[PDB]
Design a binder for these strands. Structure first.
Ligand SMILES: [Cl-]
Ligand SMILES: [Cl-]
Ligand SMILES: [Cl-]
Ligand SMILES: [Mg+2]
Ligand SMILES: [Mg+2]
Ligand SMILES: [Mg+2]
Ligand SMILES: [Mg+2]
Ligand SMILES: [Mg+2]
Ligand SMILES: [Mg+2]
Ligand SMILES: [Mg+2]
Ligand SMILES: [Mg+2]
Ligand SMILES: [Mg+2]
Ligand SMILES: [Mg+2]
Ligand SMILES: [Mg+2]
Ligand SMILES: [Mg+2]
Ligand SMILES: [Mg+2]
Ligand SMILES: [Mg+2]
Ligand SMILES: [Mg+2]
Ligand SMILES: [Mg+2]
Ligand SMILES: [Mg+2]
Ligand SMILES: [Mg+2]
Ligand SMILES: [Mg+2]
Ligand SMILES: [Mg+2]
Ligand SMILES: [Mg+2]
Ligand SMILES: [Mg+2]
Ligand SMILES: [Mg+2]
Ligand SMILES: [Mg+2]
Lengths: 70, 77, 97, 50, 147
RNA sequence: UUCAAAUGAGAACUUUGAAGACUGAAGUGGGGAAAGGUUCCACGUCAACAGCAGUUGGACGUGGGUUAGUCGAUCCUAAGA
RNA sequence: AUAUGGAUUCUUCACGGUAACGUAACUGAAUGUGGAGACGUCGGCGCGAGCCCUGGGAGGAGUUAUCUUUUCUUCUUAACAGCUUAUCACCCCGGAAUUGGUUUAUCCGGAGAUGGGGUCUUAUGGCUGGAAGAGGCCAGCACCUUUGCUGGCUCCGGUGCGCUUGUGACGGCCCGUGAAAAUCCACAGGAAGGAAUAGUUUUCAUGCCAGGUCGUACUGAUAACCGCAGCAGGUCUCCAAGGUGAACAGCCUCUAGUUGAUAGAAUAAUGUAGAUAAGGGAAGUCGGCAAAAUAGAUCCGUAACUUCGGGAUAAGGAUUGGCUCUAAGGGUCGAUCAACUUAGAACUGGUACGGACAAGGGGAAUCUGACUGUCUAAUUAAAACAUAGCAUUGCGAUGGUCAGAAAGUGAUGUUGACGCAAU
């Protein structure tokens, strides 16, 4: 997942099973003040949902990841 | 995906208010029965289509480059 | 039309284990023209100057044939382990040591 | 198979998480008689039968 | 060591089967340290991992045998296992001959050598197995025009 | 099936190289439906299991991995319910 | 969601073509009609794609005592878009027996042939854009290294009863004539709305925004499924190279994949599996059980009987290699180019030649069932069942046969005696 941050400009999150792509995109913008290009999601074999959130070229995922704390 | 053959139409596309990028490609190919010549392709990136103009005259090609709008971002080779 | 083939033998000759004159003589009596050997009737001409072997032919000749004959010449003198036939550009070749 | 309903996949997910050995520190608790997980499952020995 | 995973990655990177991958037996230490596909590509570049050549399946004897058949060899009664129909259907022979005869009749009529009345008579004779080959039809036309 | 090297306390059985062979395109090749459910991949590891062996494994321990406006489901109706 | 450009209107809702019809566009409510969705199987023929085979040339590799201008390998082009490309069908001119045209296959024409000139469907192919900047094959340089940098070439043809598959026009067959619906479009119709200082068209072009939810790893089987198991069993389907040959047969090879099944030593008896035998030839045995013999192809020859279709590969004979030649059978326009088919003749050998592989024993009669077909999963495949044919029985719907505890309930019946039901 960390390889996708500095290379693909993509942030990886674990999200609730009840959230769709509309809600995931809205939540990321409000919590982190960034722009989302697209969202891809999958249901993991352990029963949790993982979302691939790619930011627009105007933002750097690595800078956002450091600000969050990871 | 689309090819144009009229130069006057090409200049109208370059200032269509949705075109931001363009590229120039140089090909070293041979003619019907002579030695190889220089072929240049002018490609205009539209919102939904890519327009390609190909001119086989090097002398007429250099004039087209100088006539391109300065605001257009042009990629070389 | 006629076609020209040039072989650069500078590197093997500088060492002294290769003789351009002997190699040039090999192409005279081993090139087949419209059948067997000995039919170089103003069709195939090979000239050497001590550093470049130049072959001009108007009959059926090709780079593959020239390499095939050269490899046979190298194998006959046991030179395959050191000398290699390499094409630098179109119809221009050289021997690498 | 690759084609599976959500209910089946959710059922399979729980069975994966329940298939693990007992933590070591639990055996050190006062009045503990549990040694090994008696409900361990292997995919080739016992089938889920869903 | 255990280089099972290195050979699998090398085959995918090079693009051939695992039977065509050669790992240097004297470079075991550096091969074992190559866990990624990028590291495999470097080992291919410096010659530590090479692609073996394909096994030769020459067609020299096949070509030589085909040349003998084109000269009429190996075609006796002791070399035939199928029936004459199985080797060459009789319908195929008939279709070739009738199309030859009809193509000639149209050519002559268009050229003006034969009028449509004689053409129509010869059209139904060829369909009726009157002429055994193109030569027999040409001779018949000459005799008809000579009388 | 054979020779050698590497690893290891330990090698007829693990890895690499060499050799001899087979499947011979209605395959011992390359993909799927149903069914199974993590067996997939890496690292660590050999008490039990692989009716010999074992340093290997579909075993044991810890982690990683399945991304769709266009592929399916979803919609339609069939015998029927 | 919306704007601009284009088109159209003062003859308000476009023009051209004799016509088939053409186009960048070029109002259309209710209601109605039509099309698409939408369909069996077999046979040969035409065409396309991939594969196969092959020539020249530009690279790389193998062999080289001798021979081989040689053996192997690379030379690729997606969705989509523009122009163009068609058997069939149709239009105009014209008016046919001295009937013509025409398919491998016999069908078409005064209800308008042949012929000349046109229109259309775009399966499909060609060129170009996509696109060489990709991918592929090589050469020359740096170097623990994050690992790259610079160069070239990637071209032009042939062949076909080939293989696989798609498709087109046809033909054969039925007491069998071989789904439905969602959905999309066109037409008929003319309710309304509309121009002159102005409007409509989002079925013409360009531009703007969004597209949720669940599945997606891997095995798919002599180890991941089911049989108590890592069981020689069972379990639906797609792709398919070269040679031999009729062949998806057997046998050998390329690509790819495996080399897994407890081992070592020895070679008694008895076994299991595979084989050979002098002379005799079913004397063996309930019984020719088992085994042997026959076997491909070409030519010759073929009885009783028969429902005239068969019997039939009846029976019974001959030939088959290799090599060097000869004759005949074609395409395009005298010339030039390209396919394996058949027949024949010399020469040659330890008389061998469908040289391995592959591959019918036959005949004279009796009992019985007509035939193809079907059943006792795990001891019986039959003469048993079924079958077409034949005959009998019931019934005209307030009905026959049959179902249900009942019913404002059902099957035959989307049926009607050339039918349904019962033997
Ligand atoms: Cl799964
Ligand atoms: Cl024995
Ligand atoms: Cl009878
Ligand atoms: Mg998804
Ligand atoms: Mg496990
Ligand atoms: Mg025939
Ligand atoms: Mg026939
Ligand atoms: Mg075999
Ligand atoms: Mg084999
Ligand atoms: Mg594994
Ligand atoms: Mg054991
Ligand atoms: Mg053990
Ligand atoms: Mg998958
Ligand atoms: Mg089970
Ligand atoms: Mg099981
Ligand atoms: Mg069970
Ligand atoms: Mg005997
Ligand atoms: Mg005897
Ligand atoms: Mg007796
Ligand atoms: Mg007796
Ligand atoms: Mg028997
Ligand atoms: Mg019977
Ligand atoms: Mg039959
Ligand atoms: Mg039984
Ligand atoms: Mg039985
Ligand atoms: Mg009976
Ligand atoms: Mg009913």
């Amino acid at each position: 997942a960390m390889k996708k941050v500095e290379d693909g400009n993509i942030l990886v999150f674990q999200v609730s099973m009840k959230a769709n792509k509309y809600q995931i995109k809205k939540a990321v913008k409000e919590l982190y003040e960034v722009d989302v290009l697209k969202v891809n999601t999958l249901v993991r074999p352990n029963g949790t949902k993982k979302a691939y959130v790619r930011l627009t070229a105007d933002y750097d995922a690595l800078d956002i990841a450091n600000r969050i704390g990871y | 995906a689309r090819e144009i053959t009229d130069i006057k139409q090409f200049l109208e596309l370059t200032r269509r208010a949705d075109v931001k990028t363009a590229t120039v490609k140089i090909n070293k190919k041979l003619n019907k029965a002579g030695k190889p010549f220089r072929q240049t392709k002018f490609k205009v990136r539209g919102s939904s289509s890519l327009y390609t103009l190909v001119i086989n005259d090097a002398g007429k090609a250099k004039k087209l480059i100088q006539s391109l709008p300065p605001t257009l971002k042009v990629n070389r080779l | 039309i006629a076609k020209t083939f040039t072989v650069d033998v500078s590197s093997p000759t500088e060492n002294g284990v290769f003789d351009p004159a002997s190699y040039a003589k090999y192409l005279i009596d081993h090139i087949k023209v419209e059948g067997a050997v000995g039919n170089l009737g103003n069709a195939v001409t090979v000239t050497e100057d001590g550093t470049v072997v130049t072959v001009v032919s108007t009959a059926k000749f090709s780079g593959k044939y020239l390499k095939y004959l050269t490899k046979k010449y190298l194998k006959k003198n046991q030179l395959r382990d050191w000398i290699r036939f390499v094409s630098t550009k179109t119809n221009e070749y050289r021997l690498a040591f | 198979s690759s084609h599976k309903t959500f209910r089946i996949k959710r059922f399979l997910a729980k069975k994966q998480k329940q298939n693990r050995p007992i933590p070591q520190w639990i055996r050190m608790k006062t009045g503990n008689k549990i040694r090994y997980n008696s409900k361990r499952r292997h995919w080739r020995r016992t089938k889920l039968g869903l | 060591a255990n280089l099972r995973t290195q050979k699998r990655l090398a085959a995918s990177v090079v693009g051939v089967g695992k039977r065509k991958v050669w790992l240097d037996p004297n470079e075991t230490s550096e091969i074992a340290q190559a866990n990624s596909r990028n590291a495999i590509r470097k080992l291919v570049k410096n010659g530590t991992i090479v692609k073996k050549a394909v096994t030769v399946h020459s067609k020299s004897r096949t070509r030589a045998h085909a040349q003998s058949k084109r000269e009429g060899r190996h075609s006796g009664y002791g070399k035939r296992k199928g029936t004459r129909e199985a080797r060459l259907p009789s319908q195929v022979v008939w279709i070739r001959r009738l199309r030859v005869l009809r193509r000639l009749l149209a050519k002559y009529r268009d050229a003006g050598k034969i009028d449509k009345h004689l053409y129509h008579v010869l059209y139904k004779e060829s369909k009726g197995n009157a002429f055994k080959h193109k030569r027999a039809l040409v001779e018949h036309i000459i005799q008809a025009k000579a009388d």
